[PDB]
Amino acid sequence: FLPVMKLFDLLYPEKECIPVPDINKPQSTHAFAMTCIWIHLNRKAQNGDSTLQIPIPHSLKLHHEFLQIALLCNAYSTNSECFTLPMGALVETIYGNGASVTPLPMNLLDSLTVHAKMSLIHSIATRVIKLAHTKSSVALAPALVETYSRLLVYMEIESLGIKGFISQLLPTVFKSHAWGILHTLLEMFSHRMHHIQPHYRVQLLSHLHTLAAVAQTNQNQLHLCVESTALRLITALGSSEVQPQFTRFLNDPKTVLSAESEELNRALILTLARATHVTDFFTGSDSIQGTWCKDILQTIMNFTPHNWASHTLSCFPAPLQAFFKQNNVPQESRFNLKKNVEEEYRKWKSMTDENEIITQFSVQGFPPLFLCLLWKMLLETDHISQIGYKVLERIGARALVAHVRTFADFLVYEFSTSAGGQQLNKCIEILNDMVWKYNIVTLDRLILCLAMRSHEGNEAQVCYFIIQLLLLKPNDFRNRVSDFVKENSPEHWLQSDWHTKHMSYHKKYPEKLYFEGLAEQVDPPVPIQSPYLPIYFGNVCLRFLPVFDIVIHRFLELLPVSKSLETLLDHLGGLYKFHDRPVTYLYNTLHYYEMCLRNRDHLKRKLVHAIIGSLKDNRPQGWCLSDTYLKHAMNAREDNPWVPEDSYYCKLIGRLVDTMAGKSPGPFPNCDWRFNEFPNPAAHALHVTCVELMALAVPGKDVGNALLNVVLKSQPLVPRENITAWMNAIGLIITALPEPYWIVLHDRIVNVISSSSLTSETEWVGYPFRLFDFTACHQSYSEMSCSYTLALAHAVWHHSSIGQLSLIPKFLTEALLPVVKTEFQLLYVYHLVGPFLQRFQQERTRCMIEIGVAFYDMLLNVDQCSTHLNYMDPICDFLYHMKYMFTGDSVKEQVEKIICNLKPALKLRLRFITH
Amino acid sequence: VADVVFVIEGTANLGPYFEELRKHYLLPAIEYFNGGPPDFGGDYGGTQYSLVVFNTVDCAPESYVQCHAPTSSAYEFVTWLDGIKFMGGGGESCSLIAEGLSTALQLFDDFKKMREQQTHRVCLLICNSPPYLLPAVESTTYSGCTTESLVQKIGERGIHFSIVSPRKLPALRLLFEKAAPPALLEPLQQPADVSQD
């Protein structure tokens, strides 16, 4: 540090006095930096007890004694002797106290925590772990731990630390019930912190799964919420993350992943399908690499969900569980219906005078035996008689999942057996109305249970109206979510009063769930169970995402469902203010629907105005040019946005090429580069690209042509000095578009560009190398359109080089065969496919052989149709390179069956290929 | 505060002896103002000083002064000038540097323009050969003699000035005590480093 400090004082502090008093209440660290480094080197000298205690603080002598404003609390505590006065300057825990039951509101991030990193690392950590060691001796007063959750760089520096601390706390399950610490933070820790390392987050997911399974949970009755939380971590990030981490969960499925979280496992496999959709992990092989997922299927085969039974098997990459289709045994062979009905009748007649014994008889849950009792109660004018309340509080804590599954199944069966309207009206009047007050589910669990049996072959056509009436029922709770607008838009990152806000919220709307709405014989209120209740049930929004997905992405056959969905967000749009990733949420919805959605796409002409409505639920001031599209897409949408979008596209991609050195890093990014998915603004590009004109017949062909017009035609704004970055950005975009959009591109390229005339006599420009090589655009000539297109391909293949290459072999095997006669066309297709063999040698090993045999097929074709080869040695040493560097010694035999029937000259030329 | 001046001139007359004196008088003197010579920042810290060693007209018909040592952080350039001063100086043994000390006075002058906001200015000069010459400066406006130099160093400014010569004693100390302000040329002693020479 000696030379560094010397050079810093020399260069930076170049003066002879002590200027710049620098009060600077907003920010003064930059000014006091020199004084602080001098204080630190003096502290080091004093610790060494030598070097004259580092004298001469002259330069900033005044600032040397500035210690004797809350924002001016620059804690230099890290060095020494600043843990009494400066440490107390920071808001500590509450020791005076033990519904505003928490004083000392939270501190702001930008104010002081932006700088105090080297000092505050584990200060509050030691306190909280010391409190956690023995027990929760008193009701935990410090709720300031929210600030502890509002620590991003701190986690970035001590991720391993908090993991180790949590693992060391884990023996709390042997100590006392594992409650008094975990339910304290695991929710808010996961809510307030959105961005985290992927390996770390999947390890946390695994640990949470184990903790849910082991140890025993039968004593933790409120663990239900813990399940819901676990949903987010597997649903909100499942795009390309699970596959690299395959090595880290090689043994976890072998021991425990299917204990009781069957709904979690279903959401997991749905997200896994969504992920593996990109990029074509099922096309190449059949069951070789399937070990990556087949083990997972093992879990699924423990309970065999997803049993359409050859009815609507179209929205999947490749149905592998379709082999295990007979293990479903739906509706228990259609016979156990009346049997369980008679069973529950007999059990009712018995429990009439056996309650004190049926308490101990009703063990093991007995799903299609007990919950049907509900069908009786409130059906006989509130004939509950509180006999079942104790039973539910004792046994139905966990097994309620299969219970409500059978309940959904039975209610759908009843709605179907109604058959005419004699009951439908009575249903809407009483049956779906009594479920409101006061079910423990609170419209949270029923969605996935309904989904598990709705998509089945039995009565998929009428559960539609069930979902319809279900979404139409909310008219007393949705108003709470409606007035809940004033929590996120005002403050979502700069929390200053959220504490009392959510306090008043959980005081106003909810009253109680553990007791009944009717006071039985004895009811001691004693309201004390409120240690930590920051969020009550707002988290459902996470699981609210599959609701649409399972009802839109899965059910799209009947069009009037549109009339449903447009209402939902119209009442719950504002609820979306926690995450925005529509790309992974919408891409799967059109993987193969386009070829048949066209007519229904007319109704999508409405749905887009709904989907963009979900985009409307965001007020960060982050859009200044998409608003042009918005304005030109509000009146007579079937007139304006067809053509000029091309230019608009340029404007759009302009921002892309404005990502590097321009002025776009101004008002575009804000608030706070932390949770708005901003590692790079490039991710903002793919936002609208697909949903732009998917309403009309624009997709299929016109979209690809529009995307490629930026190349073959000289756009006015397009400058000829940086087209490289332009094509790069075009490829970046293309990487996020559905199949046909970027497959029509290949057909357009090979259609006429590679074959304008090019066979009889193109021109004296037929020199292949100068033309087909890029960077010739550096001059205002030698920029023939075709060559441009070449780079175009390279462009996308400059970034789409993960799994998309599996497309080119087929794309070769047919298409490139009957289009090539001469040799420069061969050099062209070579340059097209050539410089990518490394990606096949690495991953797509099975396809490089096809690429090679395609090369040799082109060779045989140009040999059979040619007067004489003009550029023999180029192709010769080209093939030499390809052989000696990429094919090794595998294809040697097959090429033989072609290489023998070549021209004698070519035969002598390629003689040494035999070995 | 602590405005000192370090001067030596016996390089031409006697070089190795200085190296010996450095082992007993020069090096301990510097430690009075530093925790130990190592490599630290240098600025107007009051305790800075200069290092001035030149030769005589014997074999230098084109050079008299080349001093450069404003602050030097009291360690680096100090030790450098100590160990890398010079090895030259021939001719004969009649006078080596008197005109030098006059320039030394001039150095004090810049302190008046640099050390604004007293400082108990001190100075020390070493010369083995007994000096005497007619010229005064030949470098700047100021001019005088050895007598003028000493009366300036004493009366004009209360700069404590001593001369720690080799163990031998020439006919110099006598005239150098004719100043009414206490010259304090006492620090020529084998005893350890004086507090303030």
Side-chain angles (χ1 to χ4, degrees), chain A residues 3 13 19 21 26-27 29 31-34 36-38 40-43 45 48 55-70 75 80-191 193-701 703-713 716 719-750 752-763 765-780 782 784-915, chain B residues 2 6 9-10 12 15-18 22 24-25 28-29 31-33 35-38 40-50 52-58 60-61 64-70 74 83 88-91 93-95 98-111 114 120-124 126-127 130-132 135-136 138 142 144-146 150-151 155-158 160-162 166-177 179-183 186-188 190-192:
Chain A
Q27 45 182 354
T29 76
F32 295 156
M34 262 289 293
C36 204
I37 69 154
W38 212 263
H40 280 48
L41 60 88
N42 277 61
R43 161 73 206 105
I56 311 285
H58 171 278
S59 44
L60 286 196
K61 62 177 79 45
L62 277 79
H63 315 75
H64 178 38
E65 289 318 298
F66 185 74
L67 75 163
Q68 304 298 139
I69 309 179
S80 182
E81 285 309 309
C82 316
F83 289 100
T84 67
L85 186 62
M87 194 267 294
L90 187 139
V91 303
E92 304 298 323
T93 179
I94 296 92
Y95 283 161
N97 209 327
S100 279
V101 69
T102 294
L104 198 42
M106 319 313 168
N107 172 38
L108 278 295
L109 305 95
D110 169 52
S111 48
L112 279 297
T113 83
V114 65
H115 168 70
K117 66 175 181 64
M118 70 299 296
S119 300
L120 198 141
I121 52 172
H122 67 284
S123 44
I124 190 54
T126 53
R127 313 303 310 280
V128 63
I129 65 178
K130 206 169 186 181
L131 293 186
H133 278 299
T134 176
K135 67 168 53 181
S136 183
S137 45
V138 301
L140 292 179
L144 272 57
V145 308
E146 186 90 4
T147 55
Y148 155 75
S149 315
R150 296 292 176 174
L151 300 184
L152 183 136
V153 286
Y154 303 95
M155 301 319 168
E156 180 197 3
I157 201 60
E158 205 68 26
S159 195
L160 290 89
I162 187 62
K163 183 255 169 179
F165 275 49
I166 280 294
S167 46
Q168 273 291 5
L169 288 184
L170 285 184
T172 190
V173 72
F174 292 83
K175 171 85 184 195
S176 44
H177 298 296
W179 182 45
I181 55 165
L182 306 187
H183 281 79
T184 300
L185 77 163
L186 314 183
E187 305 88 4
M188 295 313 296
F189 155 78
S190 44
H191 290 287
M193 175 64 54
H194 195 103
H195 159 270
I196 191 64
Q197 202 266 330
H199 165 94
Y200 197 77
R201 71 179 70 189
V202 59
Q203 195 40 258
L204 190 139
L205 171 147
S206 60
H207 272 90
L208 167 63
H209 202 87
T210 72
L211 263 292
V214 170
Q216 69 272 15
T217 316
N218 304 7
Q219 60 86 30
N220 184 14
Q221 310 290 68
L222 72 162
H223 80 95
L224 275 294
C225 68
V226 190
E227 316 167 8
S228 45
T229 56
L231 171 146
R232 173 177 54 188
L233 307 95
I234 190 62
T235 74
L237 54 99
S239 70
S240 45
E241 282 68 21
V242 62
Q243 172 85 54
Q245 308 321 298
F246 82 110
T247 177
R248 290 296 90 88
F249 45 81
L250 83 168
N251 67 78
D252 179 56
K254 280 305 292 294
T255 169
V256 179
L257 279 177
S258 84
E260 291 92 7
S261 88
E262 301 305 319
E263 58 281 347
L264 272 297
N265 292 317
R266 162 71 79 89
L268 159 57
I269 68 188
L270 291 159
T271 44
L272 291 174
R274 172 184 79 188
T276 181
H277 166 65
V278 293
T279 67
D280 268 349
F281 288 162
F282 283 162
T283 66
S285 315
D286 314 308
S287 179
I288 303 89
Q289 285 77 13
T291 79
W292 173 89
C293 45
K294 182 73 57 184
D295 54 345
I296 303 163
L297 272 72
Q298 267 308 122
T299 71
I300 291 89
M301 80 92 71
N302 303 337
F303 297 91
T304 181
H306 276 174
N307 301 114
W308 281 262
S310 75
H311 270 238
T312 305
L313 304 191
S314 160
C315 181
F316 307 96
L320 295 198
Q321 81 299 328
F323 210 62
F324 305 93
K325 78 164 63 66
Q326 310 83 10
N327 50 10
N328 181 45
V329 58
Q331 290 182 349
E332 295 93 7
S333 309
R334 185 63 180 85
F335 182 74
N336 201 2
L337 186 68
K338 275 78 66 179
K339 303 320 296 173
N340 73 70
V341 166
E342 202 277 323
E343 183 274 339
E344 52 88 13
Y345 285 165
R346 174 78 269 176
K347 291 291 109 176
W348 177 272
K349 305 308 165 299
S350 64
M351 67 187 49
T352 55
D353 213 18
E354 80 164 338
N355 175 38
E356 68 274 359
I357 307 304
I358 207 162
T359 47
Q360 303 93 29
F361 162 73
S362 297
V363 306
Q364 312 159 24
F366 288 166
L369 290 80
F370 165 71
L371 197 67
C372 171
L373 285 191
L374 286 199
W375 183 258
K376 292 294 153 187
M377 57 92 80
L378 267 72
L379 178 82
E380 308 304 314
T381 302
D382 196 73
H383 196 286
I384 175 168
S385 87
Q386 65 88 32
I387 51 171
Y389 189 80
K390 315 303 161 301
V391 194
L392 74 88
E393 275 192 342
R394 283 159 63 253
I395 315 177
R398 288 91 179 78
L400 52 83
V401 285
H403 286 85
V404 302
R405 285 167 174 172
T406 72
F407 185 80
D409 183 28
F410 179 52
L411 71 89
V412 186
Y413 176 77
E414 181 67 46
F415 273 105
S416 46
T417 47
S418 315
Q422 197 286 328
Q423 195 177 2
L424 279 74
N425 277 88
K426 295 181 62 180
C427 304
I428 309 297
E429 285 295 327
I430 179 175
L431 311 179
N432 47 9
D433 288 23
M434 49 80 72
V435 69
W436 306 341
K437 186 260 293 178
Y438 191 74
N439 225 330
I440 307 101
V441 180
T442 76
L443 59 97
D444 295 332
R445 317 275 81 89
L446 78 172
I447 61 150
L448 188 44
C449 86
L450 189 146
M452 284 177 155
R453 313 307 309 163
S454 190
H455 66 248
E456 305 284 282
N458 41 36
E459 292 90 6
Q461 55 272 25
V462 287
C463 318
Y464 169 76
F465 212 67
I466 302 304
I467 311 177
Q468 182 260 337
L469 61 87
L470 166 60
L471 57 88
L472 177 143
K473 286 320 287 157
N475 56 3
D476 54 332
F477 168 67
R478 65 169 171 193
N479 57 5
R480 308 302 295 161
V481 178
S482 82
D483 62 61
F484 200 71
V485 289
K486 298 106 169 177
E487 280 84 2
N488 194 87
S489 296
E491 286 293 352
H492 43 253
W493 171 252
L494 296 174
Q495 284 68 237
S496 316
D497 72 298
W498 189 60
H499 205 188
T500 67
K501 192 57 169 295
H502 72 69
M503 274 170 170
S504 44
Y505 162 67
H506 95 287
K507 197 52 188 170
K508 278 205 62 188
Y509 157 67
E511 175 42 67
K512 203 53 195 300
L513 75 162
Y514 292 162
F515 282 165
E516 200 200 3
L518 167 58
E520 62 267 19
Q521 289 70 79
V522 307
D523 284 301
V526 57
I528 199 55
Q529 301 88 3
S530 279
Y532 273 74
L533 278 73
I535 186 65
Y536 192 67
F537 280 105
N539 46 33
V540 293
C541 48
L542 312 163
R543 189 175 174 177
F544 198 62
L545 213 59
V547 190
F548 296 96
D549 198 291
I550 199 69
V551 83
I552 297 314
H553 170 234
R554 187 58 220 172
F555 198 105
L556 207 56
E557 46 273 46
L558 312 184
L559 69 167
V561 66
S562 45
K563 261 61 65 177
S564 77
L565 66 94
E566 54 182 346
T567 78
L568 317 176
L569 76 169
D570 267 2
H571 300 85
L572 295 87
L575 171 56
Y576 289 162
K577 276 187 285 185
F578 308 91
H579 56 86
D580 43 356
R581 289 295 93 197
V583 56
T584 175
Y585 190 66
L586 198 149
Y587 198 73
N588 198 13
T589 64
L590 207 52
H591 70 97
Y592 197 40
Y593 283 174
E594 163 74 10
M595 284 322 104
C596 44
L597 207 52
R598 51 99 193 170
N599 42 27
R600 214 225 61 78
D601 273 331
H602 198 184
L603 274 297
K604 171 60 68 175
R605 191 256 194 189
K606 212 86 176 298
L607 301 195
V608 287
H609 273 213
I611 293 314
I612 70 183
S614 68
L615 168 59
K616 287 188 174 59
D617 187 40
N618 201 33
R619 303 278 93 84
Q621 193 54 257
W623 284 266
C624 296
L625 311 164
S626 192
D627 272 328
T628 315
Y629 176 73
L630 183 46
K631 169 208 166 297
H632 287 242
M634 269 304 114
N635 57 344
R637 278 84 66 190
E638 62 270 15
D639 300 356
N640 183 81
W642 283 327
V643 173
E645 270 307 321
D646 46 44
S647 45
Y648 204 90
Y649 294 158
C650 318
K651 295 156 185 165
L652 182 50
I653 77 172
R655 314 168 53 178
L656 279 296
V657 288
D658 201 17
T659 312
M660 282 72 72
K663 288 301 293 182
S664 200
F668 285 67
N670 270 314
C671 182
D672 182 59
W673 298 269
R674 301 294 91 96
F675 293 151
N676 265 20
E677 302 322 292
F678 199 92
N680 170 10
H684 291 74
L686 51 83
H687 61 299
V688 63
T689 75
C690 70
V691 285
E692 283 164 353
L693 260 173
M694 61 174 295
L696 294 176
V698 181
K701 218 163 76 174
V703 290
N705 287 54
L707 298 192
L708 62 87
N709 292 125
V710 72
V711 192
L712 78 162
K713 295 187 196 61
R720 306 132 285 188
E721 69 271 14
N722 51 346
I723 81 176
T724 80
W726 278 55
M727 310 183 98
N728 176 31
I730 307 303
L732 301 185
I733 304 147
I734 283 297
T735 46
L737 275 295
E739 182 179 2
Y741 296 3
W742 64 278
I743 304 301
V744 59
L745 175 148
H746 291 182
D747 314 329
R748 173 54 51 100
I749 296 313
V750 306
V752 309
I753 314 168
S754 46
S755 43
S756 81
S757 72
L758 298 198
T759 191
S760 66
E761 178 40 60
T762 169
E763 201 58 32
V765 72
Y767 184 54
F769 292 123
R770 209 206 182 194
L771 168 57
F772 294 161
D773 175 44
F774 189 69
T775 69
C777 170
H778 193 202
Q779 88 170 8
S780 279
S782 77
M784 310 179 59
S785 66
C786 45
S787 45
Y788 274 14
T789 79
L790 196 169
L792 188 152
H794 285 192
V796 310
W797 286 333
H798 192 243
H799 191 269
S800 49
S801 178
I802 180 167
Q804 283 75 13
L805 274 298
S806 278
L807 267 295
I808 69 170
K810 293 184 176 300
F811 174 55
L812 266 287
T813 45
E814 289 84 2
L816 275 300
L817 256 55
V819 288
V820 58
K821 329 289 179 186
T822 179
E823 76 293 336
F824 69 89
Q825 301 178 304
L826 170 147
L827 269 76
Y828 183 71
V829 57
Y830 277 24
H831 293 193
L832 292 198
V833 61
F836 304 97
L837 320 182
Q838 315 97 307
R839 322 292 292 192
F840 306 94
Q841 181 165 270
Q842 177 46 55
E843 186 263 304
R844 276 302 180 179
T845 79
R846 195 258 181 191
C847 319
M848 68 93 54
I849 295 95
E850 269 78 354
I851 303 302
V853 62
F855 276 119
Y856 281 86
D857 189 359
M858 303 307 255
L859 297 165
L860 74 86
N861 290 293
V862 62
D863 181 311
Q864 291 295 336
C865 314
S866 44
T867 173
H868 92 285
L869 184 45
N870 49 11
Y871 294 140
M872 214 184 190
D873 192 76
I875 290 91
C876 199
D877 49 12
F878 180 94
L879 191 143
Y880 281 166
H881 195 322
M882 306 318 141
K883 176 177 181 180
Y884 178 59
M885 296 303 294
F886 296 95
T887 192
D889 53 351
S890 47
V891 68
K892 301 181 71 169
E893 56 277 350
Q894 292 103 358
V895 306
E896 192 50 53
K897 209 173 298 185
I898 295 92
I899 208 163
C900 204
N901 51 78
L902 312 182
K903 258 185 181 180
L906 185 57
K907 191 168 169 63
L908 175 47
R909 186 85 39 188
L910 317 181
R911 166 183 164 82
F912 279 176
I913 298 314
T914 178
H915 311 133
Chain B
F6 192 76
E9 282 304 308
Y17 296 81
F18 165 80
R22 178 179 178 271
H24 283 170
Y25 314 106
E31 287 183 352
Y32 195 82
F33 304 97
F40 263 88
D43 73 318
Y44 167 56
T47 180
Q48 70 269 13
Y49 59 90
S50 198
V52 51
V53 190
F54 303 136
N55 52 346
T56 182
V57 78
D58 55 357
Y64 290 96
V65 304
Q66 67 279 353
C67 200
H68 53 297
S93 66
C94 80
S95 44
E99 73 295 328
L101 306 96
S102 46
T103 72
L105 157 70
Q106 166 197 74
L107 318 182
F108 270 76
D109 301 352
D110 66 52
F111 291 139
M114 176 50 159
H120 50 268
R121 274 77 66 194
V122 181
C123 44
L124 171 147
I126 316 297
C127 60
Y132 156 72
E138 277 55 50
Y142 298 94
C145 174
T146 54
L150 63 94
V151 301
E156 194 268 340
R157 181 165 292 173
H160 306 164
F161 157 71
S162 192
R167 201 173 157 275
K168 68 177 287 185
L169 300 172
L172 184 140
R173 65 185 208 281
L174 274 298
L175 191 47
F176 274 59
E177 309 313 302
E186 287 189 354
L188 204 163
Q190 293 196 321

